[PDB]
């Protein structure tokens, strides 16, 4: 019912200092210098915030093998008290329909609060319509339109100008899947004309190009009707760097990288065994430059990127094997919602590359702000929801498959000594992971409804309105 | 019949040095140290070959006033012997009967001599076909497709992929007109329902975004086919960034500015007076920022963009104003084709950021290494085409709409004070102007054919197919 | 003594809402939903701090007439509670005498907080050890070190390194004027010797390359030493591209545009009044690129660059008349402390180009977050000192030089038209501007220390030590 | 006495055809369609031109191996058929004095022709005027100086800023290596402090940040004089990306890759075997970056960077020993002399990133028009001097140091198959490499001498004085 974090070194996104936190009813209630947690020279940071997941998705031929279940217990035994998952409703299917489908998937299972992004996946009327009661009455502000896989989420570029349009007069930000769908099918036709069956070809059909050429073209469409956009799993550092310059232009964009091209890269697609190669397929793929993790990263550090998710997606091996003479057949995904927070406290903070702050921001603080759950979460503040992990620096991880809370039987990460370790998750004031152990039943999560209009995105887009919209030039009729 | 040169500085792209040219036939048959013409303290230059002109086009609503008598002429008295024109088709209109009418327009009516491109307005297997015809039998190494101009001449991705992929079995260039046609015509909706109707409403509807979006797809697709890209009249500072970091990376691509975004911006599109800002109007637009000619000259020096034309396609103030009240159905097209070289010596080489030999190589000598008229072409040599200027650096010229030889009555470099005069014009070894006064007669410039795989281009992308082609990771099978 | 701040909105760097401000004692006692004031519809914005102030100052040839009085007058006139001013010694001058005689200055006189900046003007044990007692005795954090100005405050690159390097050890950082002293002086000869007396030479001997240069030259030295920069007065678009850059790279730099280049440009070093064009004389000079302040004003708001000050060292026309016939004797320095804050609403948040929330980080918090003094200052919170302004955005303002509250009788900002207007001041918990009407005396405001080891700058940077220090690779003996 | 080169495709810089080669007297008598030699399906090129050699140098304790004779050989078995070496004085020694003592150690040894660079290694009026007569007497046009090696070579920026401007006036180009000698030498006390004496200390003290600031600050010195500029051996992408955008901004600077930093990397320097890491040691270092050689071949290929030299200065395995506790002592230099021109034809053009044109102007071409050469050398026309390559691009070839000629024990290219073999080598008209058998003597080949202002170089830059010298502002007197 009550509990008091001592002696700990409360961390935000904008400030550390010494203090004690007094948690009660599942809310921070006092801040300052039954259970009392010692905490002494250890970090208490917010709860992670995973923006992308896909738990137990019925994708390609199959469905992914993390649950809303085991896949929040993963989430809360690496340091994330919170999951955004995707509502995906097929070309002629309701979004609303698969809205509601989603959540009686995840209510009952969930053990860790979450929301839902819906993707738009086909455009008309009846679409444009389903949007706004998504906003009014479900309670979401963000939606997901594919530019890859064609004939199956792929839309076309008057259908991102009208999607985006949507997306701006309901107040919601607009997600995208930036990769070229045209390009990446030509593209897989070639490699298995040329015998290229293996994992290699599904990167060899995308080289990052594709990827950039979509980023930009997604920030063109955005700019144009003055909507704000999110690209999510950003794989690339010329995606990346496309993202970059467009923010230094001043186009209210935003990235995301995710714990896979945070933490590995794409030269495991040449590897010599087969599963091996086959557990790194996702889209975008994993690039095949080892700098691509250090400038990801680095961009991150500087705000160029600016939010973290994983995009969760894990088949077994016998899973994967659906592909193992075509990778077009091979289920796209892999593993991350456990380790992102560790992956990046390695690879970012003790690395040197930024803060303790700048990682609560990146793990957790910006997503709050970015889809309006600012400063529920994101930030151990009075009134702020007691999602809260003690996390300890000093201390080493290793990531194996065979130690790992996730339902996948292969890690990405394997075999990676991390630094920062969550050795108390609490979850809705309640200790939920502790030293190994779960204390935690399904359903004990809930989803957490969002508003529209999220002032740190839409307060510079509604000025915009106001002073970049073109007045004529008076001049005398010819 | 004989010419003789005499105390002249012959400046090619390579070098230059004092010494005499004789010409015979047509052809310079001599070089070192009945007519004698005084070239002491001048220059003698290649003459400029324009790889981009609309002579008498009936494009939208009429036909440019600049016809192919005329336009040669004009261009002639300018410096420039030789020009390339487009030969377009309608949707569903074929190649090969386009071509031909656009050689019955110009045959009898040319003063120096020509040559065409062949635009894909397009694609069936019928486009597929003509395209080897006319490489075969008709001279054509070039085509032109369009990424603007939605139901006239708009292709997609998918035939962008296609069009490229018959350029390089064929081997021809792609030229490609870059600009997001779905985002014109939703952008031209906006300001008409704003009541924006002028000119202005033109370059608004169409910011530099929209230019460089299509230009990075273009390379993206001509990149994963392997096949050259050739990038019509850039205007932009951003769509030349694209081309200049697209060749950085090594991908085969090059830019063509034109006299108008060299020698002018897009500033006077909010010209007080209409029909001042309607004779700006063209795609792409001129650019709202007075730097771009700047910037555009320094890349051009740099051989970041390689080649110059003029996009001419010239009409009349009263032809114009078809678009008085609607900025949608004004003709576009500005002047460009007798001033080229002068605003270029003046931009680019008076200022002091390129020899008199990139001059050459960016007027003339790139133009002919890319469609395969070098060295018969852009360079005097022997056995070189006698297509010569004598060039003046020392006087000074202006520019005037009053003066000019142009059809127009208006030009866009009014009042334009330029270095480098052509006192005297050589084309087909015969003087053809001599201050201010022409030796000329309709139907003395003739047709040149062009063969395909130009080796300046085609040898490092057959070299590409050799080694670059990604071959299957030896493993054993799950 | 007690002030209570009803129906406003209060906006911080992070988050904005609608809630009530209880100061007593100085200090915010309070928030939630004998003197009330009504800020319904208007702002409740945290305290300007300007970074960057040069109150009387005995520069080349005379002091400038806004004094610690004056200055700070005119600085809550504007919206400014707070401002960080730099002690200069000479060349073997003694910095503690320095800070001492600036205190004695600034105590008496001043109407607002403030703290001081030290430059370390020549190297030596001596300088070495007195920096030390200023950061341990005195309250100091910060050091400028002079690139240009050559034989009156510049140093060479071996005394940047050491400088740096004590910078390190004692915790303070290091703020750098970026311009090559070799190249200002060498050009300023050549100008004279070509008979540029005038105003327009002082920019032409200073091109932004040599601004550039020497950033990119301070940002590798502090690199190597690991040393955190500062880089003070960024004027050119270069100079914040190398900045900006650079902290993609993962460089540890931060950049400080002043009014004068975010709101005007050096175009009017050009103009044909003698007195207009040296009222604009400053180092680095405003640049002849109109373009500037649109550019660093986007950086600004993407966090590129992050801090504002002004640079404020005003002198009259007869003053700067010292240099009419020799622009090296002109003294250097513009206005900006009163308008900074109008300026950059103006510029910034009304353009569209930031929120409300990042204005605030951007002339307040990211200053105290760098200087160690956040959350005292920068942030409306319980226990933050009361320094707070009542903005209205929707009201407008046109800055004059003879309706402004500066000792100058120029004004370079004159004319300009600015939205955001500071209606109520408070500085210390007490009203001291209020509708044109000052409620101040001098010595009200207090010098407040500043301790070392800032964690916004040097958290990141003690990991760097521990994980970036190289270590030899075993090897047998040759 | 005379050749005839058969059936062979020749190959310039700007074209290639299928011609007949006929040599008498040392030069290139005829071009068209008592020995002969048949070149059937092979390629005939112009004879490299190294831009860059230290052939038996007192370097630091001892001299190079590869003296002026079995360079040389070792050159022609390569397909290089010049040199331009280095005439390196002490500081207080005379220019005029090393000029004369690197002639006389060069003269009866060369077997291929050959040029000097000298190097300002100190300023005063006595070098001042030296410089004048080395290139009015002395046929010398290129002036090498040194921004590393403090108290050996390094010179000051204002001694940079003199030099180059007397470069100016008397018409040669400034050569300079670009890295900041305060930072290495600061850079290197640390690492051995650290106990790093390994040769990984030697790259580790020598970020590539050190290399580009030095580079950009060159370019920012020559640019303030207006003095052509010359990057000897870049090494990184940092210094590669400098130039590159300097030339876009229209700088007049040129990029010296060399055949070790676009044929192998810096990870050596961490190898296991302590001589292995130590061969690779040289000013400034191979990159740990793979990605380098890729990065550096792609800007050549596109002109970003134009020339190439080897900066041959070979040391064999016990002369490298004399650094075996302290990196400092390691003689720095590496091979490259031989291998040049096969390790840039298969990195470059096998690979697809240029042209066989492309391959000529990089080898021979551009270095020929830099230091005025062209036409008499780097082009195979009726009066150039007869050095000629027969190229085979089909064959394969391997790089061993058991293999080569060059005199040092140790190749940094060992291993590496190439594609493009030097048949046969003809240096001044006379066949002096055929399948591994030389026939040359000892001072067969000759000192050529070079004019000052080279076209290629000041035609631009005497255009700069006339035109982009400011002029003032006409005003009344204040
Ligand atoms: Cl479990
Ligand atoms: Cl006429
Ligand atoms: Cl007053
Ligand atoms: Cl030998
Ligand atoms: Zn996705
Ligand atoms: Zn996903
Ligand atoms: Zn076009
Ligand atoms: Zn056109
Ligand atoms: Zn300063
Ligand atoms: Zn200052
Ligand atoms: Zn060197
Ligand atoms: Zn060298």
Not at 5 to 24: K, P
Not at 286 to 296: E, G, K, M, V
Not at 406 to 420: D, K, L, R, T
Request: charged content about 25%; hydrophobic content about 40%.
């Amino acid at each position: 019912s009550r509990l008091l974090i001592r002696g700990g070194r409360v961390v935000n996104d904008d400030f550390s200092e010494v203090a004690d936190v007094l948690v009660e009813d599942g809310v921070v209630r006092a801040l300052g210098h039954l259970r009392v947690l010692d905490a002494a020279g250890k970090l208490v940071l917010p709860g992670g915030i995973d923006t992308h997941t896909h738990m137990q998705f019925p994708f390609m031929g199959s469905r992914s093998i993390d649950d809303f279940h085991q896949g929040t217990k993963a989430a809360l035994s690496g340091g994330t008290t919170m999951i955004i998952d995707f509502a995906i409703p097929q070309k002629g299917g309701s979004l609303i329909e698969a809205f509601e489908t989603w959540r009686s998937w995840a209510d009952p299972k969930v053990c860790c609060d979450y929301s839902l992004h819906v993707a738009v996946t086909w455009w008309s009327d009846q679409v444009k319509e389903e949007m706004k009661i998504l906003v009014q009455d479900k309670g979401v502000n963000s939606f997901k339109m594919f530019m890859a896989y064609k004939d199956l989420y792929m839309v076309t570029d008057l259908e991102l100008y009208e999607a985006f349009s949507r997306c701006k007069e309901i107040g919601a930000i607009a997600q995208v899947h930036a990769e070229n769908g045209d390009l990446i099918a030509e593209g897989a036709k070639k490699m298995l004309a040329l015998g290229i069956t293996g994992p290699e070809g599904h990167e060899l059909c995308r080289p990052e190009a594709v990827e950039a050429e979509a980023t930009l073209r997604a920030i063109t469409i955005a700019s144009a009707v003055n909507c704000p956009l999110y690209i999510v799993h950003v794989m690339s550092k010329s995606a990346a760097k496309v993202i970059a310059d467009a923010r230094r232009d001043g186009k209210v964009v935003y990235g995301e990288p995710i714990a896979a091209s945070l933490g590995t890269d794409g030269t495991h697609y040449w590897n010599k065994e087969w599963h091996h190669a086959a557990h790194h397929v996702m889209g975008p793929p994993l690039r095949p430059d080892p700098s691509t993790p250090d400038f990801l990263m680095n961009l991150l550090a500087n705000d160029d990127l600016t939010t973290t998710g994983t995009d969760n997606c894990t088949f077994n091996t016998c899973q994967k094997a659906l592909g193992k003479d075509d990778f077009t057949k091979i289920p796209n995904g892999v593993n991350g919602v456990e380790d992102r927070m560790s992956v990046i406290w390695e690879k970012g903070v003790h690395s040197g590359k930024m803060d303790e702050n700048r990682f609560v921001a990146v793990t957790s603080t910006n997503a709050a702000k970015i889809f309006n759950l600012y400063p529920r979460k994101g930030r151990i503040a009075v009134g702020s929801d007691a999602d809260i992990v003690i996390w300890d620096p000093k201390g080493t991880r290793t990531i194996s498959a065979k130690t790992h809370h996730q339902a996948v039987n292969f890690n990405i990460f394997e075999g990676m000594v991390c630094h920062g370790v969550p050795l108390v998750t609490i979850s809705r004031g309640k200790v939920v992971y502790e030293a190994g152990v779960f204390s935690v039943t399904a359903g004990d999560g809930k989803f957490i409804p969002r508003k529209p209009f999220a002032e740190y995105i839409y307060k510079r887009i509604k000025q915009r309105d106001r002073t970049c919209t073109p007045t004529p030039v008076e001049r005398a009729p010819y």
